[PDB]
Each structure stands twice: as structure tokens, then as C-alpha cells.
């Protein structure tokens, strides 16, 4: 994004944290501006010797080396959890077949088996069921409860 995020004279709107007392945990967001105590003297929010501002601007100029040119980054994290799944691919659904050996896919849960009308008393919230072996034993049709 050098054409957009760089300007003659240096674009400094984009910042990065340069000092921190410890490494960040995954997906932690720190926006604090407390003066970093590099030495033994408490800073009390006052910059100076061994008291530095934790942030610094990026120098994004159109003439900067590609290593230093601005890049826009998007990170997608996917929540493969045991809950109903609401972000799906464009893959179309099909009709359901019972009492046949079939290759089924319910919401990404894939397998091969024979699907039959069950008599299990699923609760209004319970999505699919499991057997003693922690294997999928019963499902809820995403389109039909």
C-alpha cells in the first residue's frame, strides 16, 4: 500500500509499540501510553533519561525501500468450536437421504454412515450428540430441527 500510505516528507499517522515490559499474549491489544521505565528511577508519567514514550511513528515515504514500504495486513482467525456454526462457505446444500450408506456433511462435520430418524431427547440447545468413544453419534440437521 505504498501508493496510499506513503507521502512526500514521510507519513507518520501509523504507529507501533516499541517498548514493553513483557511479550504480548496471543490476540492481546495494548493501547496504554505509560512511560516505560528503562532504568531504576520511576518515571511517574514523565519522559526523560531512561523514561521513553512506548510508541513511535512509521516512516512511510514513497521512496523507501520495499522492506520499509507500507503493507496492509488482514488476519483471519477461524473459530472451530463446538457451537452452531454461522460462517459457512458458498457450497450449496442438497436433499437428505435416510436409511442408506451415504457420505454426509452437516456444517463441515463430515462422515460416512446411515442416517435414521432418532428417538434421542435432544435439548432445544443441543446441537449434536456423542457416544462413549467421543465419536459423533447423532446430529441436528442445520435446515430442520
Amino acid at each position, epitope marked *: 500500500s505504498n501508493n496510499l500510505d506513503s507521502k512526500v*516528507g*514521510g507519513n*507518520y*499517522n501509523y*504507529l507501533y509499540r*516499541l*517498548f514493553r515490559k513483557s511479550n504480548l499474549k496471543p490476540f492481546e491489544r495494548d493501547i496504554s*501510553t505509560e*512511560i516505560y521505565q528503562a532504568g531504576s528511577t520511576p518515571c511517574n*508519567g*514523565v*519522559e*526523560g533519561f531512561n*523514561c*521513553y*514514550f*512506548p*510508541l*513511535q*511513528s512509521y*516512516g512511510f515515504q514513497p521512496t523507501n525501500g520495499v522492506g520499509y514500504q507500507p503493507y496492509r495486513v488482514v488476519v483471519l482467525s477461524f473459530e472451530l468450536l463446538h457451537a452452531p456454526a454461522t460462517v459457512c462457505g458458498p457450497k450449496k446444500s442438497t436433499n437428505l437421504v435416510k436409511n442408506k450408506c451415504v457420505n454426509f456433511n452437516f456444517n463441515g462435520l463430515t462422515g460416512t454412515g446411515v442416517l435414521t430418524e432418532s428417538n434421542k431427547k435432544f435439548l432445544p440447545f443441543q446441537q449434536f450428540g456423542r457416544d462413549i468413544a467421543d465419536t459423533t453419534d447423532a446430529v441436528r440437521d442445520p435446515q430442520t430441527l
Partner: nanobody, 125 residues
Framework: VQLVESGGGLMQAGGSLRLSCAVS????????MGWFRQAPGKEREFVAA????????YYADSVKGRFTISRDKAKNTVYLQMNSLKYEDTAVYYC????????????????????WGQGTQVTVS
């Protein structure tokens, strides 16, 4: 940004004088303002800078202990309190704006800034 200085004038040695400078536009909280001066026949010289957030101050050795820089956030105005004026303080004083945020405060003494005020003359008799 537009920078407008005021407060220059004639003062006797030993007196005190306050210059003012109003900042408008992209008033970055994580930036800094600096005051510099240029004496006749001499190069422009950095005096002091203050960060908008927190108000930590940095002074040139030539002015340390005599001058004070301050800023009023609500009014978007920065002030340089020029105490114990000496002949060597005679110069055109300019207030300049930085849009670059630096972790090391001392860098604002030497950083090339983005925008400069017009200057106000102080002459010490």
C-alpha cells in the same frame, strides 16, 4: 496546520516574557511541538520541545534552567515562558510542528519538522 506566534517585543535583561503559539488542524496527541530561534547571521537553532500527551519537556542546553515550555490542551495553544532573558536570547523565535511520534524524546531536538510558524522578534536591550 497553521501556526501563529505572539508575545515578541522589547525587554530588559533580567526580565521575563511569554511567547504563545496556537496549533490547529491535525492536533496529534502523540506528537510534539518545538520552539527554535534564528539570530542575525546565524543558523536556526532548536530551543525546547514538549509532547502534547503527558507534557514531558525537552530543553536545549543553551536554555536549560532559564526557559519553560508549557501547553494548554483545551485551548490548543503552546507557551514558552522565557525567564531570565539575556542578550544571547535575541533572535527570531519560531514555533514548529512535528507529525512524527518518537519514542526517544531527545530526537525532537534534531528531527526535521513538517511545519513552521512565521516567527516573532524578541530584542533584548
Amino acid at each position: 496546520v497553521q501556526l501563529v506566534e505572539s508575545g515578541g517585543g522589547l525587554m530588559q535583561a533580567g526580565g521575563s516574557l511569554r511567547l504563545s503559539c496556537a496549533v490547529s488542524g491535525r492536533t496529534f496527541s502523540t506528537a510534539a511541538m518545538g520552539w527554535f530561534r534564528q539570530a542575525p547571521g546565524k543558523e536556526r537553532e532548536f530551543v525546547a520541545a514538549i509532547r502534547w500527551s503527558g507534557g514531558s519537556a525537552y530543553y536545549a542546553d543553551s536554555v536549560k534552567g532559564r526557559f519553560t515550555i508549557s501547553r494548554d490542551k483545551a485551548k490548543n495553544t503552546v507557551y514558552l515562558q522565557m525567564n531570565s532573558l539575556k542578550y544571547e536570547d535575541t533572535a527570531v523565535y519560531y514555533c514548529a510542528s512535528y507529525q512524527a511520534t518518537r519514542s526517544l524524546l531527545s530526537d525532537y531536538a534534531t528531527w526535521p519538522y513538517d511545519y513552521w510558524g512565521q516567527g516573532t522578534q524578541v530584542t533584548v536591550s
